[PDB]
Structure 1
Amino acid sequence: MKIPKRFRTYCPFCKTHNEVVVERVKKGQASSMTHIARQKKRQEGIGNSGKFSKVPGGDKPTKRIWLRYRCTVCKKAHQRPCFRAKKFEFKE
């Protein structure tokens, strides 16, 4: 499973066909100031705590490949529905 580093595809902002650069979308780290974290602080007391003592869930046999297509003119990225592959070479 390869895919070119660059190719020519419609840019939804420029509304024209021109080169794009493909890259990998890396999952960030959850911050501590969102309201879920504040709720987790407010709900920690004595004993059980509901959602925040849930065991972590399982996983699926193969995840999707999450990619971001960034234009080379306006530098504005856009995302597309992603396929599912095990080994993903990124064939420039």
Structure 2
Amino acid sequence: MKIPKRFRTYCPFCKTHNEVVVERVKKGQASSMTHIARQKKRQEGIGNSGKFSKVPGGDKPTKRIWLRYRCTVCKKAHQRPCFRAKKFEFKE
């Protein structure tokens, strides 16, 4: 399915309907300095590592389309609950 790249909607921050550009959200790299990373490094030793030797699970048949809406006026972005589609495109 297609969603427009830019459309007029409500900005929660400036509290008005302005034009907003839609951007697909890319998952970031997990920090190596997080508390879970430090706990993993601390619990690594000889033997089973507990939950840190878990293999990542499976996948749902379709993933949600992670979208982020940036107000064109205040340049702040908000992200809303998103739909779930096999094929996603931007209308231009």
Q: Quick check: TM above 0.5? A: yes
Q: Deviations over 1:14-71 (max 9, x none)?
A: 1111100101100000010001111011101111110011121011100000000000
- Structure 2: runs of 5+ lacking an equivalent: none
What is the total number of aligned residue pairs between the two structures? 92
Distance 1:68 1:18 in 2: 15
- Structure 1: runs of 5+ lacking an equivalent: none
Runs of 4+ aligned residues of structure 1 deviating over 4 Å after TM superposition are: none
Distance 1:38 1:83 in 2: 35
The alignment-based identity, stated in percent, is: 100
Say which structure is richer in strand: 2
Distance 2:2 2:9 in 1: 17
TM-score by length of 2: 0.96
Aligned-residue CA RMSD in angstroms? 0.7
Q: How does 1:4-43 map to 2 (within 5 A)?
A: 4-43=4-43
> How many angstroms does 1:91 deviate by?
1.1
